[PDB]
Paper text:
A major factor that limits the expansion of shrimp cultures is, however, infectious diseases from viruses, such as P. vannamei nodavirus (PvNV) and M. rosenbergii nodavirus (MrNV), which have inflicted heavy economic losses. The Nodaviridae genome comprises two single-stranded positive-sense RNA that encode the capsid protein for viral capsid assembly, the RNA polymerase for RNA replication, and the B2 protein for host RNA interference suppressor. While the shell domains (S-domains) of PvNV and MrNV contain conserved sequences of 62% identity, the protrusion domains (P-domains) and N-arms show low sequence identities of only 17% and 43%, respectively. In this work, we have determined the cryo-EM structures of T = 3 and T = 1 PvNV-LPs at atomic resolution, the crystal structures of the P-domains of PvNV and MrNV (PvNVPd and MrNVPd), and the crystal structure of the S-domain of PvNV (ΔN-ARM-PvNVSd) in the T = 1 subviral particle (SVP).
As for the MrNvPd, three crystal forms (P3221, C2221, and P4332) were determined. The structure of MrNVPd (P3221) was determined by Se-SAD, independently from PvNVPd, and all structures were refined to 1.39–2.3 Å resolutions. First, the high-resolution crystal structure (P3221) allows us to locate clearly the metal ions. The 311ExD313 motif on turn β4/β5 interacts with one Zn2+ ion through direct electrostatic interactions. Glu270 on turn β1/β2 and Asp355 on turn β7/β8 also coordinate with Zn2+ ions. The distances between the Zn2+ ions and the side chains of Glu270, Glu341 and Asp355 from three separate asymmetric units are ~2.4 Å, which is in a reasonable range for a Zn2+/ligand coordination. In addition, these three key residues are involved in another Zn2+-binding site located at the intermolecular interface of two MrNVPd dimers. Similar to PvNVPd, the symmetry of MrNVPd dimers (P3221) also generates a dimer–dimer conformation, but with additional metal ions coordinated in the dimer–dimer interface and with a slightly altered bending angle of ~120°. Three key residues Glu270, Glu341, and Asp355 reveal a negatively charged interface and work together with three Zn2+ ions through hydrogen bonds connecting three turns β1/β2, β6/β7, and β7/β8, respectively. Examination of the intermolecular MrNVPd dimer–dimer interaction reveals that Glu270, Glu341, and Asp355 donate major hydrogen bonds to stabilize this conformation (with the exception of the 311ExD313 motif), suggesting that the negatively charged Asp313 on the MrNVPd monomer might exist as a potential metal-binding site without participating in the MrNVPd dimer–dimer structure.
Author numbering: 4 to 126
């Protein structure tokens, strides 16, 4: 276990949200490989060419006690906003619900996320 005076963060876990296959979709994704039972923040980031076709995605977390929402939008009124606080489950995962509303969806590029972990104690 890491002493509190030695607190650091790891903000290098990045990943992609699976793109929808239809213009309107509600679906889930399990993020895996996280330290079991650790507490995290996930935030959106963007490094992504705009579709110009109004690709909206909203994300929440299904884990008990998770709070927050993440918003993406790529066209004019850009959104890369919100965050979720959550705890990985006992198997190192967390499930998210994605609600997508895309005006057009030909080979849609994934929206992107960053996980922030405080490395302290056993977290
Ligand atoms: Zn799994
Ligand atoms: Zn509670
Ligand atoms: Zn294709």
């Amino acid at each position: 276990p890491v002493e509190v005076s030695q607190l650091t963060y790891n903000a290098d876990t990045i990943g992609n949200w699976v793109p929808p296959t239809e213009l309107k979709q509600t679906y889930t994704q399990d993020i895996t490989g996280l330290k079991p039972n650790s507490k995290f923040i996930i935030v959106p980031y963007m490094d992504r060419v705009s579709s110009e076709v109004l690709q909206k995605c909203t994300i929440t977390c299904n884990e008990v006690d998770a709070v927050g929402s993440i918003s993406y939008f790529d066209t004019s009124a850009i959104k890369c906003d919100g965050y979720i606080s959550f705890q990985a489950n006992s198997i190192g995962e967390a499930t998210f619900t994605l609600v997508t509303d895309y005006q057009g969806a030909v080979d849609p590029k994934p929206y992107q996320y960053r996980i922030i972990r405080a490395i302290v104690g056993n977290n």
